Amino acid sequence: SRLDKSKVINSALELLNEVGIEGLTTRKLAQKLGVEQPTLYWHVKNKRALLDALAVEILARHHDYSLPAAGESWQSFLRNNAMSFRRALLRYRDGAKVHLGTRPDEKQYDTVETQLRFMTENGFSLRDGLYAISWVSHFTLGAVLEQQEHTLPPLLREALQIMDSDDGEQAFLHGLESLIRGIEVQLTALLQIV
Amino acid sequence: SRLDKSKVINSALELLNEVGIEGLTTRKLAQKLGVEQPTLYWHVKNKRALLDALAVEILARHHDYSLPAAGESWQSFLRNNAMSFRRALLRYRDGAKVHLGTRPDEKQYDTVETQLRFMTENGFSLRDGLYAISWVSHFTLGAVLEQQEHTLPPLLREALQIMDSDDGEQAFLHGLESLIRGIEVQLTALLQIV
Ligand SMILES: [Cl-]
Ligand SMILES: [Cl-]
């Protein structure tokens, strides 16, 4: 049963959705592919290897806003990128955990390099351009991991009603906007005292 | 060998540091406590139960800045709280993952209720006071999970030198300051167009 790299990964992504990050094993993947374990091992040595491949493909398939447009503002870049990252992570079960668990890839540095060039051309130091992107990343990952994880007193109750209703999109977008404005302030200040 | 709730949890925290969140099992905890598995089961029914207990204790022991001081500014509250949360999570291996994986506790709502009362007294709606605290939380969790997880092109290189050197404290504190300023802007705007 076809053991092309593409086909292994695809069967693995399907499996990820059935069983989650814990449950997913090479033993279960071979059963799925209709193939003996030593035959799969020839192709995929371990779970670590499999997960790395998965982490790269999820972004390859869904993370479509990774490079800025022509003449785009840094603010809009960071907003579109984070929106894109977020939906790429929400696409598969435990998707955020798959991303957390893997060292970055030899395309992810090339794309991040254009991203960081873009930031330095817009007034960001380099450490600062790196930080700004890290922070948006951290914020988005944290927001997704709590959304993907989770399926008394009066005030907590009373503000619940937007905890449910919306999936987390409004809360996420409000906070992303807050974070980008804060990074603006620091940037434009240069520094007089801010 | 003493099976007090306190003593079980403490042995579990030690074990958490040895084996991490995956490795930790009830079977391994019983071996540690010098006790047969059915004897442990009387006290702790499953891993889910154990992890819940651990998640609450880590914050009970280390999260010391969970309530504002007398006359404290909302900004300073959010900054001290997040600093405190962060160090509480960095204290045990996979500490951030233990927190992610558990529904909140019947003290965590009472303390969050005072926190949210505090925010509404400082001009925050309620949904907004809740969001502000959620976002700081998300940012801190994301920052910690990437620090606890992780133990080519020219610009990426050249800004690495503060990736190492510091542990993540400077980056974290710069971004927390950015995020709080952004939340200020939105708050003080009320809204004229911001
Ligand atoms: Cl075939
Ligand atoms: Cl004893």
Swiss-Prot record, chains A, B:
Decide whether keyword Metal-binding is in the record.
yes
Positions annotated to bind tetracycline? 63, 81
Q: Enumerate the residues binding Mg(2+).
A: 99
Q: Name one GO biological process term.
A: negative regulation of DNA-templated transcription
Q: Which UniProt keywords apply?
A: Antibiotic resistance, DNA-binding, Magnesium, Metal-binding, Plasmid, Repressor, Transcription, Transcription regulation
Q: What induces it?
A: By the [Mg-tetracycline]+ complex.
Coiled-coil features, chain-numbered ranges = none
What are the recorded GO MF terms, alphabetically? DNA-binding transcription factor activity; metal ion binding; transcription cis-regulatory region binding
Subunit text: Homodimer.
Function per UniProt: TetR is the repressor of the tetracycline resistance element; its N-terminal region forms a helix-turn-helix structure and binds DNA. Binding of tetracycline to TetR reduces the repressor affinity for the tetracycline resistance gene (tetA) promoter operator sites.
| Protein's name according to its UniProt entry | Tetracycline repressor protein class D
Annotated source species: Escherichia coli
**What lineage does UniProt assign to this protein's organism?**
Bacteria, Pseudomonadati, Pseudomonadota, Gammaproteobacteria, Enterobacterales
Q: Which residues of the full protein are shown?
A: 51 to 208 of 218
